[PDB]
Structure formats: structure tokens, C-alpha cells
Design a protein around this ligand. Structure first.
Ligand SMILES: CCCCCCCCCCCCCCCCCC(=O)OC[C@H](COP(=O)([O-])OCC(O)COP(=O)([O-])OC[C@@H](COC(=O)CCCCCCCCCCCCCCCCC)OC(=O)CCCCCCCCCCCCCCCCC)OC(=O)CCCCCCCCCCCCCCCCC
Ligand code: BCL
Ligand code: BCL
Ligand code: BCL
Ligand SMILES: CC[C@H]1c2cc3[nH]c4c(c3C)C(=O)[C@H](C(=O)OC)c4c3nc(cc4[nH]c(cc(n2)[C@@H]1C)c(C(C)=O)c4C)[C@@H](C)[C@@H]3CCC(=O)OC/C=C(\C)CCC[C@H](C)CCC[C@H](C)CCCC(C)C
Ligand SMILES: CC[C@H]1c2cc3[nH]c4c(c3C)C(=O)[C@H](C(=O)OC)c4c3nc(cc4[nH]c(cc(n2)[C@@H]1C)c(C(C)=O)c4C)[C@@H](C)[C@@H]3CCC(=O)OC/C=C(\C)CCC[C@H](C)CCC[C@H](C)CCCC(C)C
Ligand SMILES: COC1=C(OC)C(=O)C(C/C=C(\C)CC/C=C(\C)CC/C=C(\C)CC/C=C(\C)CC/C=C(\C)CC/C=C(\C)CC/C=C(\C)CC/C=C(\C)CC/C=C(\C)CCC=C(C)C)=C(C)C1=O
Ligand SMILES: COC(C)(C)C/C=C/C(C)=C/C=C/C(C)=C/C=C/C(C)=C/C=C\C=C(C)\C=C\C=C(/C)CC/C=C(\C)CCC=C(C)C
Ligand SMILES: COC1=C(OC)C(=O)C(C/C=C(/C)CCC=C(C)C)=C(C)C1=O
Ligand SMILES: CCCCCCCCCCCC[N+](C)(C)[O-]
Ligand SMILES: CCCCCCCCCCCC[N+](C)(C)[O-]
Ligand SMILES: CCCCCCCCCCCC[N+](C)(C)[O-]
Ligand SMILES: CCCCCCCCCCCC[N+](C)(C)[O-]
Ligand SMILES: CCCCCCCCCCCC[N+](C)(C)[O-]
Ligand SMILES: [Fe+3]
Lengths: 240, 281, 302
């Protein structure tokens, strides 16, 4: 009857929907590759969807996906086995080389912009008149690493202007230069800011930004990847 | 076999047990010690279900059902064909689920990401355990647990609920439901909002999160923001399950009468219990 | 113990954000409301502005009139006694006309007339609110995904209070306005239709409801887990994939053998959610119009 027709139709619809959804979700990262970067023989049963194009605001261009995929950066890893499916060992210092959990993506070397075309993220000192509105103000506190040594001191908060949120702490090092630390990777305490991801000796290695009052998407990725990578790679210098 | 961007993340390390022994992939799947454990537990579980099927004398997926020991067995063991298989399958399930969570932890550690996902999953596991382990233990028999069958588990839900009248009257169940409904509402809105920004009117530039905040302030006078919405979805879905587990752990233990009668405590308050008129006077 | 980004450690505030202009009639925006530091631990601290406009006024007025029509009936049932009002709050109920009145608007006020009036106000409130989800997206140049999603919820609501009663031939089939009574209505509906557990559209609606919680737990946890790489900035991750979007995808590829993108997760999201009420409204609409007894139907499969 009509209910039988409804249910049968629904299942046909649902198969169609899942096919649509899976192929939509193949707009990045496909075709699949062998470990050497060449196209894999087996691409699975879903084909790539027809490309769509996103128009980016503020003259930044467009993005068309699916599109030719490439890392656009060297990857300092090598095989540890003679067959597919094993780990790839860092050929150098994985924190410096940006691989494993220290990885970064070659994102656009421009700052993310707000809806008005201004830099989305700014040091609070340059953001009129943004200020700490609740919680312990981290500015001025010593910054301790997982080796329990002081690596520097907080000199500003970098804030997301349209979303009114703390995004980074700016930390000045012993040599007077600064680095950005992701807000998600620090613990603000009463007398210090604690960073479990990095021992104090790794702070100098945090990727620097090219201009002192802005940060590009590329620079954010290198900074965040490097800091997260310390969880695995500074484990020898941590320490309860 | 690899996403185009995948290789740089496939480094050694992050394992919880076994060092490098199981540090590898099979096609897309990470293995790890807990991948091996999941396979063992799942495989044994599935084999035992197929054996339970033989003893039941059916292979139909809509008919296969693995029932726990009858109430007379209390919390003891039972013959395999009479509840023992359920008991072993349940240990297998638990082993598989917990192994799955711990394998998710190894994957987090290799990827340098937060542990939020397996943390969240552990809520679902705790709800499963409330029904098959915690509640039956507190009530004193395995037989109060649900059977493993597609339709029989629904018989269990209906029979269990109607034991206490209309189960709608469980107040923890009311809260659980509210979180379920609110979660689906927020899921719809989040999905829609992001897509409406990423896919604007024809020919227009992608909108920004400023536009997402704007749309929602225009609409209801508030926007939780892009961080807040993901905090929210996580909170609503975990709260729904927390209150689901709560609503069942208190049923047949601290409250075992008709749930509708629980509400009399409010009606019977001295100040108004005896004023005429209304529904209850 | 690491920081988990469930609550913020430090809040910042700057000038009140008045929002994007695009094509919005700015004459119709309120001023900004207060700032709530409480809210700001978890979400945005800012309240307002809100957009008013005449459609806005209509929905609000209508919605209030719906609420007040029910509330006046409740006071009446309480015999105008505040103590009895609060005591019996969850027990009062504004009920639809008796079956005998069919679909006519000729029932007495105290016996269904008032239910129809409240229902009328609800109808205009919801539909004018739907218009508003479309128009606020339009004025901003945005897609219409919100109004499309809202329409799926509206579908179940329309099925329950309007389409199913019309097709059954009487307002008596609709849902009463009351806390306990709507629950009794729900239980009764299932009992009277041979147990909704046998309605495949009810089982589907459940799979999607549970699936919504599974999916929001998955997505919310994933985004928080990659917030240390800016993962919640999803629009710019769509435009320019970062290590947040890659680590998220790979968590899932390594776990379950497949994954999403930053854009496409939002499509699994919207559909998982809207299919709750889409399949639901279908299951209810068929109940009593085409199928009297789901258990019986299920025995014939058809
Ligand atoms: C009965 C129940 C009653 C129904 C009631 C309510 C239903 C509410 C539906 C909710 C929709 C939510 C999804 C939103 C969406 O993505 O569409 C946006 C889309 C355009 O987006 P926009 O926000 O305006 O602008 C942004 C971009 O331009 C474009 O934005 P975009 O890129 O996000 O959208 C692109 C869009 C293109 O735009 C569309 O036209 C979308 C279409 C919608 C609908 C399908 C609905 C199905 C309902 C279930 C059926 C159950 C059967 C039982 O592509 C799709 O959405 C397509 C989906 C694929 C499904 C395929 C299906 C399976 C079928 C089967 C068989 C095949 C093989 C067998 C194996 O909206 C529409 O134009 C269609 C909406 C329909 C209303 C038109 C009214 C005129 C009549
Ligand atoms: C007639 C029946 C009664 C009823 C009696 C009951 C009873 C009895 C129960 C509920 C429970 C639920 N009811 Mg009730 N309730 C009814 C009316 C309703 C109505 C309604 C609109 O009328 C609603 C919305 C709800 C909703 C609720 C939810 C709060 C809750 C179910 C979700 C849950 O526990 O998730 C928690 C999620 C899980 C348990 C899933 C865990 C799974 C994980 C760990 C692993 C599985 C994966 C594995 C097998 C993989 C497969 C292989 C492949 C990999 C895929 N009920 C009526 C009145 N209700 C249940 C509850 O709260 O349980 C705690 C419960 O026991
Ligand atoms: C949660 C509270 C109640 C309960 C209430 C109900 C009610 C009421 C209904 C279901 C329904 C479902 N339940 Mg149940 N169910 C319970 C506990 C479970 C458990 C468990 C704890 O292990 C499992 C695996 C299931 C699984 C099932 C599915 C057969 C079906 C769709 C669920 C879904 O899409 O979820 C969301 C999750 C996803 C979308 C992910 C996909 C996972 C599913 C599809 C996996 C199926 C597993 C199944 C075939 C078991 C095989 C295991 C193998 C041996 C490995 N339920 C407890 C007892 N469940 C519906 C149904 O139609 O049943 C006939 C239904 O109406
Ligand atoms: C004894 C009870 C029966 C039963 C009888 C019913 C009945 C009857 C129905 C359901 C329905 C549902 N049941 Mg059932 N249900 C049973 C047992 C279960 C169990 C379980 C046992 O674990 C579960 C999990 C569920 C789960 C579900 C859901 C999947 C589904 C509702 C989806 C929804 O989002 O609605 C919530 C969403 C809405 C109602 C949409 C809201 C619409 C908008 C327009 C809101 C406007 C509001 C505004 C004007 C007011 C604003 C106020 C604010 C302050 C601003 N049922 C048992 C067998 N179930 C529904 C369904 O679809 O079934 C097929 C339904 O009609
Ligand atoms: C807590 C919020 C919600 C939630 C969260 C959640 N679920 C999760 C996770 C999270 C964050 C994932 O990380 C994990 C996942 O990998 O998802 C894709 C998962 C997951 N949730 C899943 C299912 C699921 N979650 C559910 C519910 C929920 N999950 C909550 C609503 C339900 C419901 C509502 O019924 C189901 C069916 C899986 C898709 C996945 C976990 C997969 C897994 O543990 O794999 C290892 C085990 C096997 C491969 C099979 C084991 C076989 C057994 C040994 C035998 C079978 C016994 C079983 C008890 C019989 C049941 C018969 C039924 C008919 C009753
Ligand atoms: C896809 C399925 C899920 C879903 C989707 C969904 N719901 C939605 C949306 C979508 C995508 C909309 O965009 C729309 C929305 O605007 O959300 C914010 C909405 C919405 N879903 C709502 C509720 C709701 N949705 C339901 C759930 C669900 N919605 C499903 C689970 C439920 C359940 C589970 O029963 C409820 C109760 C509303 C919050 C909103 C629709 C708002 C509306 O139609 O308003 C009409 C009435 C009024 C304008 C006001 C009524 C008056 C109040 C009773 C009084 C108190 C408040 C008052 C406004 C204060 C003002 C006083 C001033 C004068 C000071
Ligand atoms: C922004 O980010 C995000 C992404 O990325 C960018 C994502 O991907 C995702 C992930 C979300 C999706 C891909 C959307 C679709 C997901 C759902 C609808 C959730 C329900 C999922 C399923 C139905 C799939 C269930 C399949 C599973 C659990 C895998 C089954 C695997 C086996 C064969 C089990 C056997 C044993 C194994 C594999 C153990 C391992 C060891 C060996 C291989 C041996 C999210 C949440 C996200 O937010
Ligand atoms: C303290 O006193 C004050 C002044 C504050 C007042 C207090 C107010 C109170 C206590 C209000 C209480 C309200 C309650 C308890 C509301 C509960 C409502 C519930 C639970 C509703 C649930 C189901 C609702 C549904 C499904 C209704 C759907 C209705 C429609 C689809 C509308 C259909 C339109 C019809 C039939 C009208 C036909 C007219 C035309 C021509 C369109
Ligand atoms: C599309 O994403 C969403 C937001 O929009 C950016 C929200 O804002 C909210 C609403 C959040 C809350 C806390 C409601 C209560 C409001 C106050 C004033 C306390 C929801 C559900 C949502 O889904
Ligand atoms: C909940 C719907 C069911 C989801 C499972 C279907 C999607 C699996 C797609 C796997 C394909 C992955 N692949 C080969 C394209 O890389
Ligand atoms: C939009 C956030 C509001 C959540 C609404 C969900 C309804 C649940 C009822 C709230 C009671 C929960 N609690 C823990 C405060 O008791
Ligand atoms: C569903 C979420 C409800 C959000 C609550 C609405 C807050 C409105 C604040 C607008 C303030 C307007 N004001 C006071 C400046 O006139
Ligand atoms: C966005 C779509 C995700 C696909 C998830 C589909 C889950 C289907 C579960 C099968 C339930 C079938 N049944 C018995 C309820 O009719
Ligand atoms: C509804 C549950 C069905 C289980 C299948 C889930 C989809 C997983 C597909 C991933 C397999 C990818 N592959 C082919 C490379 O192995
Ligand atoms: Fe998101």
C-alpha cells in the first residue's frame, strides 16, 4: 500500500543521499595516493564530484575543489619498512622539520580577514579598545615550560576582533624577541602561565612571525603545529 | 591508500602499549595494541552470536536474539544456551568498546590532538554499561538487562517502560529527552548556518563568521559563536546521554512504582494540598 | 591536567559588535543588549542587537497571544486561584474540540473554540517566524539552509496539529496544549496505532535522533580536539584547509576508515538532523490515514 511505497522510496532516497554526502566529502585529499605520492590503483567505489568554486572575499580569489592536490612543501620523512602501511621516520628534527604531530599545512601566507576586510587577529595593544573583561589577566606573568623552567613572560594577548576572544599569548624570550603561544595550549595560573607542550629550551624554536602586528594563516599553522608537536617530541624533558 | 595530505602525519609514536610492535596501518585503519584487542573481542563476540543463532535455530537477522540469563540465575553464571552466551558476548562487547576508545586515544597521541573524542565516546559506553551491568547488578539479576536482538531489544524497552506506567513521567527521562531534542535542533542550526555562509546566494562571495554571528543576533538576539556552538553540541549530546543513564539507574532501584505518582509530592505540599478547585481538588 | 577548552580562561571585550550590514534595513535593529560575563565563560558575552521589523512584531505578538490564550484557560481551570495555578500547572490542558464537531469552527469557546484560537495564533507565529529565517539570510546574502532546515521541524508540527487532523476529518485528533496532557496524548497515540515501535518511519526517526547526538558529539569533540590549530574557524578552513582540518579528517580515517571535510561534515550534520522530523512527520501522517495498526501492517510487511 501507500506506506510500503513510502518506505521503499525512502530507502532509495537515503542511498542517493549517502552517495551525495560521501562524494561531497571527497572534495579534499583525493585522489588517494601511494606512500610515494603517485595515484593509488584503488580509489574506491565513489567517484570525485564535479568541481564547485568558492568566491573568496576581499580580492583573495577563488577555490575550486576537487582540484590538483599537492603538499607544496618538503616532507622530511622516510620509510621504515619495505611494504605499505608502516610509519615513516623523521629524517631530521621533526619539530624543526614540521612533520608528525609537529605538522603544518602550506596555507596562504596572508592573515585571515574579518567581514570588513581588516585583520581578524591583532595584538590587544593595537585593538581599540579591547581589554581583558574576566579571568586572570595573563599579561606580565612568567611562562614556565614542562621542564619547570621559566622560558619568558607574557607581553600581550592576541585577540580575535569580530569574535572577541583570546587566540594567542605573546611571550617575550630571554633575548627580547617574542613568540605566539596558542591560547588552547597554555594554563593561566595565579602566579604563572604553564605550557606542558614545550620545555623551556624549545621556546626559541617556535616559528616567528614576519610582521610584529599581524600573523598569517601559514604562520599560525607553523606555530600551532610546532607547539602541539612538543607533546610527543619534548616527552623526554617532561617531567611530573 | 593515503589521502593526499596524509603521509606527513604517519610517524611512529603515540602507542600506549607495545611500543612499536603494533604501530602500523591496514589500508586507512590504524592498528595499535587496541586495534588488535578490538579485533579479538569483536571477532569472539560475533562468533558467539553465530553460535547463539545455531542454538536458537535461526540465521535471520530480524530473528536472531541473544537473551540474558532468566531472573532465577540472579547474578551467577548460566548454561551457554540459557544465558551464558549473553554473558560472554557482553564481556566481549565491553572489551571491544573500551579497546575502541583506547585505540582512539593512541590515534590522538600520534596526531597531537585533544582527547575529547574518546572522552565523549566513554559516555556512550557508560550508558551501555548502565543497562547491561550497573542496573542489573543493583537490581540483583542479569535478566533485567536487554537482549541482543533487533526487535527483541525493542520488546525490552516497551516492557521495561510500561513496568512503571507511562515512562514519560520519569523526570530524569524528561531532562534526557529535552537534551536530545535540543541537540538535534542545534545540529540542524549549526549545519545550516555554516553551509549558508560557505554557500551564499549565487555569484556572491563566501560569508564570514561575522555574518554568522550577525544572522543569529538578527534572528534571536544572540549568537553563541563558533567556539561556543561546538562546546554546546558536545554538552547537549553528552548531557542527553548522562541523563539517559541517570534515568535508568534510578529505575527499579530507588524508584520502582508508577512514575506518574512521583509528581504527587508537589501537589501534596501543605500550603496547597487542600485548596479546592483546579485538577487535583 | 591540561586545559580542555570547555570554558574560557580569559575573556576579552571590545566595542559592541553591531554586525554586518549588507542589505539589512538598519532602522530595524535594536541597540545592543547587556554583556554577560556568565555567558562569556562558554559562549559570546554579547547580547543583541536583534532585528525587529514588522514580520518580527507579528510573530512575537501572535506567539504571545498563543501563550496567553493557553494561560488564560489555565487560570480559568485553576478557578483564578494563584495557589491552585502553581499546584496544578502541569495538569491543566487546553483541549481540541470533541470528534462530533469534526473540522467545523462551531464548537463553544469552553469546549474547543479556545483551542482553535490558540492554534490559529500558533500557526501565524511559526509561519511568520519561518519567513523571518528566510528574510534574515536573504538580507545578508546567505544561503537559505536555515529556513530549509526549519521547514523540516515545521513539517512534523504541521502534520501533528493541522494536516493529520484535516485528513482524519476532525480537530479532536490534534494535540492538546498542556505539559502532562501532551505526554498522555503521545502515549495514547502509540497505543491506539498498535505500538509505534512497529512504524518503520518511527524507527528511522529514532536512528536519526540518536544519530544526531552521536554526530554532534563526534563533531563537537573533534573541533575542540583541533581548536589548538584554529579548527573552529571552519569557514576559512573550508577556503584554505589547515592542519586542523587534516588532523580531524585523519583521526576519523584512522579510526573508522573514512572521513569528512570541513565543509562536508556540515552536510552530514544538517541532513542527520532534518531527517529526524522528516521521517517522523511521514510516520505520523500515515498513522490512522493509511495504517490503523503498525503491528498489523508489519505482519503483512504492507
Ligand atoms: C515529504 C516531506 C515533506 C518535505 C518538507 C520539508 C523538506 C525540507 C527539506 C530540507 C532541505 C535541507 C537541505 C538544504 C540544501 O542543501 O538545499 C539548498 C538549496 C539551495 O540553497 P540556498 O541556501 O538557496 O543557496 C546556496 C547555494 O546556491 C546552494 O546551496 P547547497 O550547495 O547547499 O545546495 C545544493 C543542492 C541543490 O539545490 C536543491 O535543489 C536541493 C534540494 C532538495 C531536496 C531533496 C529532498 C528530499 C526529501 C526526502 C524525500 C523522501 C521520500 C519519501 O544540492 C542538494 O541539496 C542536493 C541533495 C541530494 C539528494 C539526492 C538524492 C537522493 C534521491 C535519489 C535517488 C537517486 C539514486 C538512487 C540510488 O535549496 C533549494 O533550492 C531546494 C529547496 C526546496 C524548496 C523549493 C520550493 C519550490 C517547490
Ligand atoms: C514504551 C517505552 C517508553 C520508553 C521507555 C524507555 C526505556 C526502558 C529506556 C528509555 C531510554 C530512552 N528514552 Mg524512553 N520511553 C518512551 C518514550 C520516549 C520518547 C518519546 C518521544 O515518546 C523519547 C524521545 C524517549 C527517549 C529516551 C532517551 C532519553 C533514552 C534512549 C537514548 C539512550 O539511552 O542513549 C544511550 C545510548 C546507548 C545505550 C548506545 C551505546 C552504544 C555504544 C557503547 C556501542 C555500540 C556500537 C556497536 C554495537 C557497533 C555496531 C557495529 C558497527 C560498528 C556499526 N523515550 C516510552 C514512554 N526509554 C533508555 C535509556 O535511557 O537508557 C539509558 C531506556 O533504557
Ligand atoms: C538506546 C536505548 C535503548 C535502545 C532503544 C532503541 C529504540 C527505541 C530503537 C532502537 C533502534 C536501533 N537500535 Mg537500539 N537501543 C538500545 C541499545 C542499542 C545498542 C547497544 C547499546 O549496543 C545498539 C547497538 C543498538 C542498535 C539499534 C539499531 C538496530 C537501531 C538503530 C540505532 C541507531 O541508528 O543509532 C544511532 C547510531 C548510528 C546512526 C550509527 C550506526 C550504528 C547502527 C546502525 C549499528 C547497528 C548494530 C546492530 C545491527 C548490532 C550488530 C552488532 C554486530 C554483531 C557487530 N541499540 C537501548 C536498549 N533502539 C531503532 C530500531 O529501528 O530498531 C529496530 C529504534 O526504534
Ligand atoms: C508511549 C510513547 C511511544 C512513542 C510515541 C511517539 C509519538 C506520538 C511520536 C513520537 C515521535 C518521536 N519519537 Mg517516539 N514513542 C515511543 C518511544 C520512543 C523512544 C524510546 C522508547 O526510546 C524514543 C527514543 C523515541 C523517539 C522519538 C523521536 C525520534 C520522534 C520525535 C522527533 C522530534 O524531534 O520531535 C520533536 C520535534 C517537534 C515536535 C517539532 C517542533 C516544531 C516547531 C515548529 C516548534 C514550535 C514551537 C514554538 C511555537 C514554541 C516555542 C516556545 C519557546 C519558549 C520559544 N520514541 C513510544 C513507543 N513518538 C514523534 C514522531 O515523529 O513519530 C514518528 C511523534 O509524533
Ligand atoms: C554519547 C553521545 C552519543 C554517542 C557518542 C559517540 N559514539 C561513538 C563515538 C562517540 C563520540 C565514537 O568515537 C565512536 C565512533 O568510532 O564513531 C564513529 C562511537 C561509536 N558509536 C557507535 C554506535 C552507537 N552509538 C550510539 C549512541 C551515542 N554515541 C550517543 C547518543 C548508538 C545508539 C544511540 O543506539 C549506537 C548504535 C559506533 C558507530 C561507534 C563505536 C564502534 C565500536 O565500539 O567498535 C568496536 C566494536 C565492534 C566493531 C563490534 C563489537 C561487536 C560486539 C562484541 C558484539 C555485539 C554485541 C552488541 C551489544 C549487540 C547489540 C544488538 C542490537 C540489536 C541491540
Ligand atoms: C530539524 C529538527 C529539529 C528542529 C529544527 C529547527 N527548529 C528551529 C529552527 C530549525 C532549523 C529554526 O531556524 C527556528 C529557530 O529560529 O531557531 C532558533 C526553530 C525553532 N524551534 C523552536 C522550538 C522547538 N523546536 C523543536 C525541535 C526541533 N527543531 C527538531 C528536533 C522543539 C521540540 C523538540 O518540541 C521545540 C519546542 C523555536 C525555539 C524556534 C521557532 C520559533 C517560533 O516559531 O516562534 C514562534 C513564536 C514566537 C515568536 C514567540 C512565542 C512566545 C513564547 C511562548 C513566550 C516567551 C518568549 C518571548 C519571545 C519573550 C519576548 C518578550 C519581550 C516582549 C520582552
Ligand atoms: C571537521 O572534522 C570532522 C571530520 O573530518 C574533517 C570528520 O571526518 C568527522 C567524522 C564524521 C563523518 C565521516 C560523517 C559520517 C559519520 C557518521 C554518520 C557516524 C556514524 C558512523 C558509521 C555508520 C561508521 C561506523 C563504522 C566503523 C565504526 C568502522 C567499522 C570498522 C571495522 C571493519 C571494525 C573491525 C575492527 C577494526 C577496524 C579494529 C582496527 C584493527 C584492524 C584493522 C585489524 C567529524 C565528526 C568531524 O568533525
Ligand atoms: C502566569 O500567567 C501568565 C500571564 C504568565 C500566563 C501563563 C501562561 C501559561 C501557563 C501557558 C502554558 C502553555 C503550555 C503548557 C503550552 C504547551 C504546549 C505544548 C506542549 C504543545 C505541543 C504540541 C503542539 C502542536 C503539535 C500544535 C500544532 C498546531 C498547529 C499545527 C496549528 C494548526 C492550526 C489550526 C488548527 C487553526 C485552523 C485555522 C486556519 C484557518 C489556519
Ligand atoms: C547556530 O548555532 C547556534 C547559535 O548561534 C550562533 C546559538 O547562539 C545557539 C543559542 C545558544 C544559547 C545558549 C541559547 C540561550 C541564549 C541566551 C541569551 C542565554 C544555538 C542553539 C545554535 O545552534
Ligand atoms: C551512516 C551512513 C553510512 C556511512 C558509511 C558509508 C561511507 C563509507 C565511505 C568509505 C569510502 C572511503 N574511501 C574509499 C572513499 O576512501
Ligand atoms: C540552550 C541551553 C538550554 C538547555 C535546555 C535543555 C533543557 C534541559 C532542562 C534544564 C535542566 C538541566 N539542569 C542540569 C540545569 O538541571
Ligand atoms: C533563543 C535565545 C533567546 C535569546 C534572548 C534574547 C536577547 C535579546 C537582547 C536584545 C536587547 C535589546 N535591547 C535591550 C537593547 O533593547
Ligand atoms: C545522514 C544519513 C546518515 C545515515 C544513517 C542511517 C541509519 C539507518 C539505521 C537503520 C534503521 C532501520 N529501521 C529499522 C529503523 O527502519
Ligand atoms: C552502517 C554500517 C556499515 C559499516 C561500513 C562503514 C563504512 C566504512 C567504509 C570504510 C572502508 C574504506 N576502505 C575500503 C578503504 O577500507
Ligand atoms: Fe562545525
Amino acid at each position: 500500500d501507500l506506506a510500503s511505497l513510502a518506505i521503499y522510496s525512502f530507502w532509495i532516497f537515503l542511498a542517493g543521499l549517502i552517495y551525495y554526502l560521501q562524494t561531497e566529502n571527497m572534495r579534499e585529499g583525493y585522489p588517494l595516493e601511494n606512500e610515494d605520492g603517485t595515484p593509488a590503483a584503488n580509489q574506491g567505489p565513489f567517484p570525485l564530484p564535479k568541481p564547485k568554486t568558492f568566491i573568496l572575499p576581499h580580492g583573495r580569489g577563488t577555490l575550486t575543489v576537487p582540484g590538483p592536490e599537492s603538499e607544496d612543501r618538503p616532507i622530511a620523512l622516510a620509510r621504515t619498512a619495505v611494504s605499505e602501511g608502516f610509519p615513516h621516520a623523521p629524517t631530521g628534527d621533526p619539530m624543526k622539520d614540521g612533520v608528525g604531530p609537529a605538522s603544518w599545512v602550506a596555507r596562504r601566507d596572508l592573515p585571515e580577514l574579518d567581514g570588513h576586510g581588516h585583520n581578524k587577529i591583532k595584538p590587544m595593544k593595537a585593538a581599540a579598545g579591547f581589554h581583558v573583561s574576566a579571568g586572570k589577566n595573563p599579561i606580565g606573568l612568567p611562562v614556565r615550560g614542562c621542564d619547570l623552567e621559566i622560558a619568558g613572560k607574557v607581553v600581550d594577548i592576541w585577540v580575535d576582533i569580530p569574535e572577541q576572544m583570546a587566540r594567542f599569548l605573546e611571550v617575550e624570550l630571554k633575548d627580547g624577541s617574542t613568540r605566539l603561544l596558542p591560547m588552547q595550549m597554555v594554563k593561566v595560573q595565579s602566579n604563572r602561565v604553564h605550557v606542558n607542550a614545550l620545555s623551556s629550551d624549545l621556546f626559541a624554536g617556535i616559528p616567528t612571525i614576519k610582521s610584529p602586528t599581524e600573523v598569517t594563516l601559514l604562520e599560525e599553522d607553523k606555530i600551532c603545529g610546532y607547539v602541539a608537536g612538543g607533546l610527543m617530541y619534548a616527552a623526554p624533558k617532561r617531567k611530573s | 591508500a593515503l589521502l593526499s595530505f596524509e603521509r606527513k602525519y604517519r610517524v611512529p609514536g603515540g602507542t600506549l602499549v607495545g611500543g612499536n610492535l603494533f604501530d602500523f596501518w591496514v589500508g586507512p585503519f590504524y592498528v595499535g595494541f587496541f586495534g588488535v584487542a578490538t579485533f579479538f573481542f569483536a571477532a569472539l563476540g560475533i562468533i558467539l552470536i553465530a553460535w547463539s543463532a545455531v542454538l536458537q535455530g535461526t540465521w535471520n537477522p530480524q530473528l536472531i536474539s541473544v537473551y540474558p540469563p532468566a531472573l532465577e540465575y540472579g547474578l551467577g553464571g548460566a548454561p551457554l544456551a540459557k544465558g551464558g552466551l549473553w554473558q560472554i558476548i557482553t564481556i566481549c562487547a565491553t572489551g571491544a568498546f573500551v579497546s575502541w576508545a583506547l585505540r582512539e586515544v593512541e590515534i590522538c597521541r600520534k596526531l597531537g590532538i585533544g582527547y575529547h573524542i574518546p572522552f565523549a565516546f566513554a559516555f556512550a559506553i557508560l550508558a551501555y554499561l548502565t543497562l547491561v551491568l550497573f542496573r542489573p547488578v543493583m537490581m540483583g539479576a542479569w535478566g533485567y538487562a536487554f537482549p541482543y536482538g533487533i526487535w527483541t531489544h525493542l520488546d525490552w524497552v516497551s516492557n521495561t517502560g510500561y513496568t512503571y506506567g507511562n515512562f514519560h513521567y520519569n523526570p530524569a527521562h524528561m531532562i534526557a529527552i529535552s537534551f536530545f531534542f535540543t541537540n538535534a535542533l542545534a545540529l540542524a542550526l549549526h549545519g545550516a548556518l555554516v553551509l549558508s555562509a560557505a554557500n551564499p546566494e549565487k555569484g556572491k562571495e563566501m560569508r564570514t563568521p561575522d555574518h554568522e554571528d550577525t544572522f543569529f543576533r538578527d534572528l534571536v538576539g544572540y549568537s553563541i559563536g563558533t567556539l561556543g556552538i561546538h562546546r554546546l553540541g558536545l554538552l547537549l549530546s553528552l548531557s542527553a546521554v548522562f541523563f539517559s543513564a541517570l534515568c535508568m539507574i534510578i529505575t527499579g532501584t530507588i524508584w520502582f512504582d508508577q512514575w506518574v505518582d512521583w509528581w504527587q509530592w508537589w501537589v501534596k505540599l501543605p500550603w496547597w494540598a487542600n485548596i479546592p478547585g483546579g485538577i487535583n481538588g | 591536567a591540561e586545559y580542555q577548552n570547555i570554558f574560557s580562561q580569559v575573556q576579552v571585550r571590545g566595542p559592541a559588535d553591531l554586525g554586518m550590514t549588507e542589505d539589512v534595513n538598519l532602522a530595524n535593529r535594536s541597540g545592543v543588549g547587556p554583556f554577560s560575563t556568565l555567558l562569556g565563560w562558554f559562549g559570546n558575552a554579547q547580547l543583541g542587537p536583534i532585528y525587529l521589523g514588522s514580520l518580527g512584531v507579528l510573530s512575537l505578538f501572535s506567539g504571545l497571544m498563543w501563550f496567553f490564550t493557553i494561560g488564560i484557560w489555565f487560570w480559568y481551570q485553576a478557578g483564578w486561584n494563584p495557589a491552585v495555578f502553581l499546584r496544578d500547572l502541569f495538569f491543566f490542558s487546553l483541549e481540541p474540540p470533541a470528534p462530533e464537531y469534526g473540522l467545523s469552527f462551531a464548537a463553544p469557546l469552553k469546549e474547543g473554540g479556545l483551542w482553535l484560537i490558540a492554534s490559529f495564533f500558533m500557526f501565524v507565529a511559526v509561519w511568520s517566524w519561518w519567513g523571518r529565517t528566510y528574510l534574515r539570510a536573504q538580507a545578508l546574502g546567505m544561503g537559505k539552509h536555515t529556513a530549509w532546515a526549519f521547514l523540516s521541524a515545521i513539517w512534523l508540527w504541521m502534520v501533528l496539529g493541522f494536516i493529520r487532523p484535516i485528513l482524519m476529518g476532525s480537530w479532536s485528533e490534534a494535540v492538546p496544549y498542556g505539559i502532562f496532557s501532551h505526554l498522555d496524548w503521545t502515549n495514547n497515540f502509540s497505543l491506539v496505532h498498535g505500538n509505534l515501535f512497529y512504524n518503520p518511519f518511527h524507527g528511522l526517526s529514532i536512528a536519526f535522533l540518536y544519530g544526531s547526538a552521536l554526530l554532534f558529539a563526534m563533531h563537537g569533540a573533534t573541533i575542540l580536539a583541533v581548536s589548538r590549530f584554529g579548527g573552529e574557524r571552519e569557514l576559512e578552513q573550508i577556503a584554505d584547509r589547515g592542519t586542523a582540518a587534516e588532523r580531524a579528517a585523519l583521526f576519523w580515517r584512522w579510526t573508522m576508515g573514512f572521513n569528512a571535510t570541513m565543509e562536508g561534515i556540515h552536510r552530514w550534520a544538517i541532513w542527520m538532523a532534518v531527517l529526524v522530523t522528516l521521517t517522523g512527520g511521514i510516520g505520523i501522517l500515515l498513522s490512522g490515514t493509511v495504517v490503523d495498526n503498525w503491528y498489523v501492517w508489519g505482519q503483512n510487511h504492507g
